[PDB]
Amino acid sequence: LTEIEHLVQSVCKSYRETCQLRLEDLLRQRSNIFSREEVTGYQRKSMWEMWERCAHHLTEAIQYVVEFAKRLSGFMELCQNDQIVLLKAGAMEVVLVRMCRAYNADNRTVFFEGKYGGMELFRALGCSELISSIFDFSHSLSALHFSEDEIALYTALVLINAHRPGLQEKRKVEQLQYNLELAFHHHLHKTHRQSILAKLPPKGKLRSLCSQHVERLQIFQHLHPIVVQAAFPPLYKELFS
Numbered sequence: 001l002t003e004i005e006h007l008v009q010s011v012c013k014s015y016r017e018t019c020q021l022r023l024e025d026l027l028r029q030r031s032n033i034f035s036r037e038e039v040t041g042y043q044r045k046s047m048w049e050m051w052e053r054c055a056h057h058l059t060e061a062i063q064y065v066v067e068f069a070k071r072l073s074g075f076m077e078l079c080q081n082d083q084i085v086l087l088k089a090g091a092m093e094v095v096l097v098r099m100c101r102a103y104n105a106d107n108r109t110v111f112f113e114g115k116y117g118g119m120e121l122f123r124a125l126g127c128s129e130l131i132s133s134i135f136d137f138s139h140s141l142s143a144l145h146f147s148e149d150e151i152a153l154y155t156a157l158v159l160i161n162a163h164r165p166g167l168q169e170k171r172k173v174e175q176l177q178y179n180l181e182l183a184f185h186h187h188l189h190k191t192h193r194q195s196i197l198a199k200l201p202p203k204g205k206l207r208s209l210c211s212q213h214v215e216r217l218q219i220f221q222h223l224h225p226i227v228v229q230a231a232f233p234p235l236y237k238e239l240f241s
């Protein structure tokens with residue numbers, strides 16, 4: 001078949017092997033919600049304990065996105081500088097997109113440590129405005145009801161972005177980007193789902209939310225640092241250290 005139909009296939013496979021939580025599991029557990037008492041239990045934890053828990057979960061989620069990127073056709077062929085630039089700009093944007101699969105718009109809950117809970121679970125972090133923004137962004141995306149294949153192709157394009165500042169081989173990121181844009185557009189046409197294009201988040205909004213998120217993470221890491229066994233050291237070193 002066409003290069004483009006094979007690329008649709010390699011991206012969707014990459015996503016399925018690295019999606020971290022299975023959509024069917026997430027959907028099934030929606031009814032499994034934290035009680036008043038369990039919520040109070042989380043709210044009473046120190047900011048230090050809640051940070052340790054949340055940092056760990058976020059680091060693990062980033063590591064699935066790194067593995068996703070490393071399985072995208074052409075990514076490993078980029079110079080290591082460009083692999084770092086794309087993942088440093090993009091990997092947390094992909095996590096915030098992946099969150100919509102684990103988010104229930106009906107009751108504004110997210111799947112966290114085995115059950116669904118609202119943003120007030122995270123009270124002890126003293127991050128309410130930022131956490132509210134992250135929930136609202138997921139609330140936005142949920143209205144699309146992304147298919148597994150749409151989120152695979154969309155999140156590939158979140159990463160493979162030739163406009164990221166600092167790319168050494170910009171022409172080669174463009175070639176990859178053009179093919180992934182064609183794959184996504186082709187797939188939406190084949191599935192009668194072009195309607196989602198007008199509804200995708202403004203790009204500026206994903207960038208500024210995620211930029212705020214990573215700045216807060218870097219402040220917490222500076223105050224109370226957790227240590228990570230880095231899946232991709234060169235990238236980590238430009239984030240931890």
Ligand SMILES: C[C@H](CCCC(C)(C)O)[C@H]1CC[C@H]2[C@@H]3CC=C4C[C@@H](O)CC[C@]4(C)[C@H]3CC[C@]12C
Pocket residue numbers: 019020021054057058061095096098099100102110111112122125127130131134213216217220
């Ligand atoms: C919004 C809250 C709190 C963020 C706190 C802050 C601002 C200090 O980072 C975070 C904490 C843990 C996060 C989840 C961790 C892992 C996953 C799985 C991945 O497949 C999709 C995203 C998700 C559900 C994260 C969402 C954001 C969460 C709840």
Ligand SMILES: Cc1cc2c(s1)c(-c1ccc(C(=O)O)cc1)nn2C(=O)c1c(Cl)cccc1Cl
Pocket residue numbers: 055056058059062063066087088089090091092093214217218221228229230231232233235236239240
């Ligand atoms: C754009 C990116 C943001 C971001 C990335 S990438 C990573 C990360 C993680 C692991 C690896 C690896 O190689 O295993 C590499 C990179 N952490 N991280 C954070 O914001 C972060 C998190 Cl999630 C938790 C605690 C502290 C911090 Cl600072």
